Symmetry: C3
Subunit: 418 residues, 3 copies
């Protein structure tokens, strides 16, 4: 009778050991992770890269007759037939100027390049930048690097490219960061006389705060800043460390592209776009990098834009961009105050030779800074490692039957002898 | 002497095994969890539901003599004696209109319904919606579905109700989302001539971005959008998975409510409120769902409001709403640009036959989109499961005394004799 | 032949036990932690303290000839030679007033000057409502910061009970209508480091346990808008060494009962300024003597800037283990509505332009009646380590602590 109770206890114990052990094994093969959040104080923080664009792609006063000839239909100033669209709400001077520029009689077309047009017709930082201050000391327009985006000629402060050393800040708060007073030059905006999908009614700038390791993607990752306010941006540096497969989904390998030195999801996307357009249309857009020939406005109309839209719509499998394992992101909180005060409106108007109306509808102040001298860390941490797995399997294996690997080896010994 | 030192080692070892084992047991019975954060890239994202209200509950030009008679005191247009308050700082025409509507001389009232009044007097989406675009293609006012909230007649785009399929976006950025130009119709706002509790000075709209599985709750979960700016809302889809008891506190079961098909904490709140008002006052407000009769403005005055306030303070224990285990939330970052530009202001003024003053103080553009084509997941994960408990207990039990469950069974066997 | 493979199996198995066991040992000695996020619903939330400053340090109409004499250079109204700045873009009345006050023919405490000349809450506060009930200016407590005379609602200091809210949403919080008094702003006639073009207020929402640090931790609120602040209460619990880096022991400073990172920072600043210049600035607390404007010019400011740059290691402030933070999302609507502009202009005896350029409404509330908890939790405790070492020790060689003791015995005998 005792051998029966022993047999039932050993059988049930071996069954429980079986299901518990297979439980821990299956849990191990899920490759699970859990998250570790930490806050690290620092005496210094590397200041991020700040890219801003004027919402107006190019200035109206800088457009020439040749530009209307080649890129007039693309720029939406002229219709398909090289004629001005409906003149509704057209200033007499502006309409006479454009009609004169669109004469096109005995006109020998000069050679045309899209990057020349954006480079010269775009808003000049030497004209927009009314004042610059970083950590209380003056900054020059030479700190801003020219970047070409979908929005046109844009500028990146502290880009850290072309051998410039990256700036640091040793104090937090509103004073100890970037602070620029800009004139968006609303007088240079393209006149809108007829409705279009590309037609926009917005006035102001677009800013993206990003690491120097990633290129700007201002059409998607930017936020707006409106004239007439000082906008405060409190930043918090976040350092992210991810896990590669099979735990998570990250690019462990650098997987460096020909266009960009450091891998970033943004660089991977704009790389995919650049390659797709170069293969499909034998030309490259203005914002894209490399050594390919830039597209002509005819190529823009008949190939480039529908090619990108078709790439977006047809299938995402062509462009699959994994996230890198080490990522520095910047968190931000926005607030606003009114500019200028009544006590300063006249002083600004006289300092820059503008009307107080113009100052009111054209001046914006951007104040980007770190809230405090610390950074957050978000790390994916492996939840079950092989040492812990063997420890748990050994513990339960010793609890239920008290056996060891040598014991099973001895049982296989007797099985071999049989 | 060897057996004595052996006895000391066995005693200390058994004590340590005791305290360590009880430690792991108690830690297991705390039912602890820890959090797993992950970020997943996706080729498509299901666009959320977007509900917006005008901050002005109903249009002044659509209020009628009957409306003033029945709900004049409730709408704050008339005083306790059904008479207009002090005419100080009142435009002559504006007051002539109100005084004419409030004559009440030889006036035979008609039947009156609060929901009819909001549906007819509220701001019409066909008039507010100056332009609509989703993923670069035009949308109609018929795409917006009428929902009644505390703010009045409100509208939900991509509501996904009445059999409509939920919309997806295949690209991120400012262009590839919802983008509407709205006219808040500040000329239709209720006149403020005298101080009152209901008096508000704001003009603009209020928006809530929410999952299709939940009804809007704009009076608490909404953010404001001001005229004269194009407001960008960058959204980040978050997928949350919680743990039920005893680990955490979530609703494991569906918890079917009569009013709503899918359970949400918001639906639970307005369910508690609706049930409470139906039980105490036998009527439901306009925003509440169901088949109960709508309240009369007298019922609003003498029962509903004090009942809700008493529900807020006295019965704070009475309404306990548990959070669902799988929740889709949307995070948002707001930014603004100025509208209109000087190059477009006059074109807008002539296109919509308005003065530039009106465009300046009445037009706002709302741009809702996904920052990137990805979503975060925040999961509560069990920190100590029974397999790990048995493994640790077996490990320490085998380290300190080398015993097993069969060993303790044999000790009870020898004790049996 | 069987004993040889048995011996090799024991050797390799003991090697595996060695490397796995030392693996868990090293992992335990990393003292790792992981984060536990939770969301807790509540019937009540303690409402925070809200400190705000006007961006303009002091009112122009309240400055007097004595104030111009003593603090004229510091206030930037007068130059080094006690002369009015460039007369470009100078209001005729303002310039005549300043020239009269700067007559200096036949003609001071910093805190008296800030306390009396600063913006009075009794004039700025056009309306107050908390949870739908009226509040008075007496509810705001005066705190002196770098921006000057500032005010804290629900400060909870001097034994006042902290306010609670039993409902969430825009209505059920603090709601104040303020007039920033842009006419009282210092006239700006020449470029200066202190020269500012902003108009509005700066706010910091913080727990009553920490002092305000509004010049660094504040956000702006612009006139002409009602800005909503949705708050989410977060309760954070960190780990002390060797797990993380926290101050487990409160270690309260003499100035304030409860320790906070901000309080530690301003304490370090006060101590440094007292050591180098034997005086304290207006914002600093304590019983020390306040600086004279000459002391400000020749000692205080360069001492503070040098303290910031020269020795950042000198002030090391550890973070407390229990920290209550408040998250916030801002949004705006336009104020006043066209239907209300006339009523506001007439109610407060101002022009509609003045209302447009001077009135702001601040609405601070909890989005919902819940708070988040973020806990650092120990990932490997000594019980788990001993359990794992015991499990692998029993799996690989099946030994125990008694087995190693007996091996020491048998080795001792032979
Ligand atoms: C991610 O960044 C870390 C540095 O922050 C890189 O190197 C790590 O440096 C720390 C020093 O404290 C070591 O403890 C880690 O073991 C290092 N990790 C590695 C993988 O060497 C790390 O290399 C970076 N990872 C990637 C993929 O670039
Ligand atoms: C309403 O405002 C007017 C103008 O601001 C007040 O009249 C002046 O008030 C100032 C105080 O700021 C006095 O110094 C002037 O002497 C007043 N003079 C004139 C001619 O108005 C007026 O007192 C305010 N109050 C009322 C009830 O009208
Ligand atoms: C101000 O700028 C305009 C720009 O055309 C110029 O014509 C004018 O001469 C300038 N005035 C002064 C005083 O510089
Ligand atoms: C949660 O899962 C259930 C599964 O039946 C589903 O019906 C429900 O819609 C889900 N909720 C959310 C918010 O995804
Ligand atoms: C434009 O509005 C005016 C009144 O503001 C009206 O008289 C006129 O008929 C309107 N024109 C059109 C084309 O609707
Ligand atoms: C620290 O915070 C925890 C979490 O709310 C609380 O339980 C504990 O009492 C706090 N410690 C104190 C107040 O000393
Ligand atoms: Ca500044
Ligand atoms: Ca932070
Ligand atoms: Ca757009
Ligand atoms: Ca994100
Ligand atoms: Ca309100
Ligand atoms: Ca929340
Ligand atoms: Cl997992
Ligand atoms: Cl670690």
């Amino acid at each position: 009778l005792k051998r029966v109770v022993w047999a039932l206890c050993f059988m049930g114990s071996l069954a429980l050991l079986a299901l518990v052990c297979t439980n821990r094994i299956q849990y191990y093969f899920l490759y699970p992770h859990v998250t570790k959040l930490d806050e690290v104080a620092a005496t210094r923080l590397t200041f991020p890269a700040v890219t801003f664009c004027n919402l107006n792609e190019f200035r109206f006063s800088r457009v020439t007759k040749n530009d209307l000839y080649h890129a007039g239909e693309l720029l939406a100033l002229l219709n398909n037939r090289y004629e001005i669209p409906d003149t509704q709400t057209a200033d007499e001077k502006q309409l006479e100027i454009l009609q004169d520029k669109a004469n096109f009689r005995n006109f020998k077309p000069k050679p045309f390049n899209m990057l020349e047009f954006y480079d010269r017709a775009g808003h000049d930082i030497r004209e927009m930048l009314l004042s610059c201050f970083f950590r209380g000391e003056q900054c020059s327009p030479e700190d801003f690097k020219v970047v070409f985006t979908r929005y046109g000629k844009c500028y990146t402060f502290n880009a850290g490219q072309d051998g410039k050393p990256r700036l640091i800040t040793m104090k937090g708060g509103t004073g100890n960061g970037l602070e620029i007073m800009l004139d968006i030059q609303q007088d240079e905006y393209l006149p809108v006389w007829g409705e279009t999908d590309e037609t926009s009614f917005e006035a102001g700038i677009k800013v993206q705060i990003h690491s120097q390791d990633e290129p700007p993607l201002i059409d998607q990752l930017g936020f707006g800043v409106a004239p007439g306010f000082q906008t405060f941006v409190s930043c918090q540096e976040q350092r992210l460390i991810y896990l590669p497969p099979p735990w998570g989904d990250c690019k462990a390998t650098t997987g460096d592209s020909e266009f960009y030195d450091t891998y970033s999801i943004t660089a991977c996307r704009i790389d995919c776009e650049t390659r797709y357009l170069v293969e499909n249309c034998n030309c490259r857009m203005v914002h894209m990098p490399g050594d390919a020939p830039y597209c002509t406005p005819e190529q823009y109309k008949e190939c480039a834009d529908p090619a990108l839209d078709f790439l977006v719509e047809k299938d995402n499998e062509y462009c699959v961009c994994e996230m890198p394992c080490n990522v520095t992101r910047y968190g931000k909180e926005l607030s606003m105050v009114k500019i200028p005060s009544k006590a300063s409106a006249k002083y600004l108007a006289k300092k820059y030779n503008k009307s107080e109306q113009y100052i009111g509808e054209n001046i914006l102040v951007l104040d980007i800074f770190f809230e405090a001298l610390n950074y957050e860390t978000i790390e994916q941490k492996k939840a079950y490692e092989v040492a812990g797995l063997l420890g748990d399997i050994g513990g339960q294996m010793g609890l239920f039957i008290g056996a060891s690997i040598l014991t099973v080896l001895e049982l296989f010994d007797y099985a071999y002898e049989v």
